[PDB]
Symmetry: D2
Subunit: 333 residues, 4 copies
């Protein structure tokens, strides 16, 4: 049996995570669910957005599915954001963001790519200083983190049909940091004979994602860069509302939708569980259940295409009805 | 009279700059032209991409139109990029990049926005270090540069119909640097009572540029961020082949197409001079010939929709035939 | 009356401040003493080494006399050293450290100099980072801080008979930081034309302090440099038991002996109060009571020459017998 | 034979280096001298201060004896300090700086210590940046370089009667940088269990070197710290004119006097060649000629005690006459 940690988090995490739990159970796989809490609502109760227990429960399971974390408007004494934290604490060094065409209004066809972003360093070391009216931030690239992220993106590419990786970078303007990242990935790519490795300057890569996204298979890049390119690519195929995500290290992983807590629509029973369900499909895949992953994805596609749709997506099916449809389509495969 | 400096630079700059000059003359404004050199082809004949005398000439003119610079593959000792240099030397702190729909294959309709990128600091401060297997770059944000770029963008936004400015930033993960930028632009916006100032996280903005680009008017952001956003935006309206730009400081400004030298077509008389002509339009606008600028742009759109098309647009018109068509179109408005 | 804040701190702080207080009362000046609390012991009782009410009492006084603070080697969470906090909280940018020949065994004669050390920046910004096996610390020189310290030291030079200021620096290996410090002091020196200003490289300076200290009147230098040069200087004239100090800014000042809490000896009834009494004399001077200050100095010399010596000076006298001797001598001046 | 590369450099380098050669010859050792040039005079007639030809000569030799460098009072385009370059280029990571009592006026009795300073990093990485009116320099400490210098110091301690090492640090204000260094030198000490390892804060060390230098045998410290400490120490025992040094790596070593090129004195044939001779002695020791090196040391001491004294030591002897006396003293041992 697999042990899955479920963390609902904030707002509509309380609706999409139960949705995904149901779909997961409909796979027929041996699944044991543990619950834990994190995020703003948690913070408002216990002065921390990731209690120690939640770390312990995470580490006790094969994988974790997380719902939503509320973006703080004001800055709040003591309130570190939860995903940012778990990334560091659990060393989830690889951020995996697929962008795939879905049968939905205004989403380009012919897109099927995976953006693998370094999750640990670059501008995200968060080592800023302000002296008089000048502020400075470290942007840090190491050979170690670059190998780690290189090998991850390479493992992902090699299990995909087109066997292709683009290293997106800015080595021309930043040859010491960004060049180190470019070169290390190229170096590490040598134990992956089956993969075609190109490199592309990040600004041009963004342009190419808009004009010719069908050109890409897997893209590897650094922290801020990948942040932008993922979110770029999601606009191509539905926006954040349908964007799944993995956060993967060597011992455990956390999967989450990218949409926030959606504070308005929360509690209203109309949130679309797609992002959460697809994240759960990513999770099944990471666990080694490739068939179920593909079955879960196929189910979601069918309901997105023909079955009842949620108000973000045209229709006025509830989360319940949408989830019901997905469960049905899944059981029939 | 206005004195314009023409710098052809490398490759197709030798074709598109003379094309722009012809159009500039067909406006019947009082124009006097001087010529300078910059770039790789110069570097090869002089040990410098920007001769000190090119700098003299630029400063003796009202404005500069620059063709294209080649970048070689692995850097040559002594060779710095001509544009990068002129930006520092001449303190052209505002990089201005329109993305406007055109009647051309592969351009969305309904787009009309301007990205204003800080052109001086951020990651382009070029301050890297490498200690053992760890590399570190400075990312620098100062009040003063942020003030300068803020007002540049607020000036641009309020000469435009919708009078709207979005500040694109990453102040949430980077509150000292990116937060200084946000607060400074917000601060100086107070002298611009006609402009509706919004802000947006840079990843969100990337996504929104892809999904709803018609919601944006002007966007202000920092150096690397802007480099990425501008090229994304260019993908929405034809790519780099048609993208005009200006580098503007307090005393001079240098305008240039973004397409590059294009060595594989250089010399064949089939380069599209559109990006240069629109750069010359931007320049006329900078000089205060607002109405001539609008005329030049209209001339170009007329021809794009209904005149000779160059091969990159699916046609077989020479640079010559296209330029004549613009000249004629222009002389009828 | 003059309002003096008294902070004992830790260990011998408890023995030498009461001694300093008695000597201050013995001048017959009008003095109100306000007692406050700071340091290690205070942290153990209160969860902060500088209670907010302490900061208040200080700002409510004309000047503060501080005893001694332990900084345990152990690395404890929540505990920041008291003096470093107050330096930054109260903007006490000038560290003033006289070294004067005195009649004790091991005092070189002919020594009479003041080291003025920049107290807010340099290595002391405490902005360090560790990435894998590489640690980086910021060392910051600002123009603003350099003029403030240069101006402070020129003024102290000005009110001294020799009118000689040495700027000690390392601008040779550090042209940008140390060069800025050096040049800025030279720029401000222009408002003090009667002061003879020299520049000496810090290491040569260290050497000259050992060989020929009579060469120096006033020395100005940066944070870590002044730290080291002060302690070298104190060594020539009897060491830490005798060394006084002021941390002075624009609105208040805290005077403090250089020695620490001295756990090995605290409670033993035998610490040398000279350093605390001389720091009190510096405080009187700062308060404008220059005759009284010299008088307190004279009483101390008289007793150092002839009177009961404490164990650190080869005698068998207690802190109390030393104090009453100084008081007695003072009463007779 | 032993191949010794001789570099006179600038000013009195031209006088003392031949004095040193003569004294080396008189030892009777099999020696080959290979003449090379470096320094300011070398830059003025050749455009670089270390020709590539010099570097070759050095690396073709077992050891190098260098005289002195003028470091001029400006930013001469192209001119870098010769020794500063050689330390980087040859990886001469250990700066060995002995301070021993000698029979001369000014010299304090009972001093016999060695300062071993880290020679590649800390503040000497020379990564300075100036942004507006704020300047920042990296101070870098790596575990790797600290292993290398700790080990070098421990061997030196191990090879000495008293078998004592003090690690001089500022880990209290700088726990990430100076802490790393302290800790690393302590882990490496585990391999030298017969060496007694103390730690002392750097400023407290400076004080202690003035009051009780007897307590030191070997001191290890980081770059800037050792710079100041060594020059402090030289002050105890006669100053620069008598102060030798080594710059030692894993493959080669350059030895050289601490004093400058002495332009006021150059050409007058009255410079004191002690410092160059004692550096020649250090070199002998580095080459395994440990008895020879002592003989040379002892020959110098006899001449310091009895024989003709140069003007800097209150005699009227020529550089020539001092040298001849040293040679004769040597030959009779
Ligand atoms: O990582 C960040 O910059 C904030 S978290 C947001 C994402 O991961 C995303 O929406 O791509
Ligand atoms: O090492 C430096 O700081 C530049 S050269 C001066 C010395 O080596 C010294 O006098 O200790
Ligand atoms: O500044 C850069 O990194 C690129 S220079 C050409 C440019 O500005 C763009 O392609 O957006």
């Amino acid at each position: 049996a697999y042990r899955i940690c479920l963390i609902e988090g904030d707002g509509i995490g309380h609706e999409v995570i139960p949705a995904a739990r149901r779909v997961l159970e409909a796979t027929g796989l041996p699944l044991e669910f543990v619950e834990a809490e994190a995020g703003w609502e948690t913070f408002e109760r216990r002065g921390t957005s990731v209690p120690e227990e939640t770390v312990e429960k995470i580490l006790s399971c094969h994988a974790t599915l997380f719902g939503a974390a509320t973006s703080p408007t004001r800055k709040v004494p003591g309130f570190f954001g939860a995903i940012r934290y778990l990334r560091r604490r659990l060393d989830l060094y690889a951020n995996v963001r697929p962008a795939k065409s879905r049968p939905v209004p205004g989403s380009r066809p012919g897109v099927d790519l995976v953006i693998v972003r370094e999750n640990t360093e670059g501008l995200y070391v968060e080592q800023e200083r302000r002296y008089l009216d000048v502020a400075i931030a470290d942007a840090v690239i190491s050979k170690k983190a670059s190998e780690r992220i290189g090998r991850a993106a390479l493992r992902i590419a090699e299990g995909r049909p087109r066997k292709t990786l683009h290293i997106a970078h800015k080595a021309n303007v930043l040859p010491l940091t960004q060049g180190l990242f470019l070169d290390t990935v190229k170096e590490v790519a040598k134990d992956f004979p089956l993969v075609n490795v190109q490199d592309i300057i990040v600004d041009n890569c963004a342009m190419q994602l808009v004009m010719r996204p069908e050109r890409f298979d897997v893209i590897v890049t650094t922290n801020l860069l990948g942040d932008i390119l993922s979110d770029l690519a999601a606009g191509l195929v539905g926006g954040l509302g349908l964007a799944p995500s993995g956060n993967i290290g060597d011992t455990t992983a956390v999967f989450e939708p990218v949409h926030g807590s959606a504070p308005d629509i929360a509690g209203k029973g109309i949130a679309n569980p797609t992002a959460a369900i697809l994240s759960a499909a990513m999770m099944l895949d990471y666990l080694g259940e490739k068939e179920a992953a593909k079955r879960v994805e196929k189910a979601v596609d069918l309901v997105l295409e023909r079955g009842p749709r949620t108000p973000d997506l045209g229709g006025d099916a509830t989360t319940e009805a949408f989830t019901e449809a997905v469960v049905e389509a899944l059981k029939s495969l």
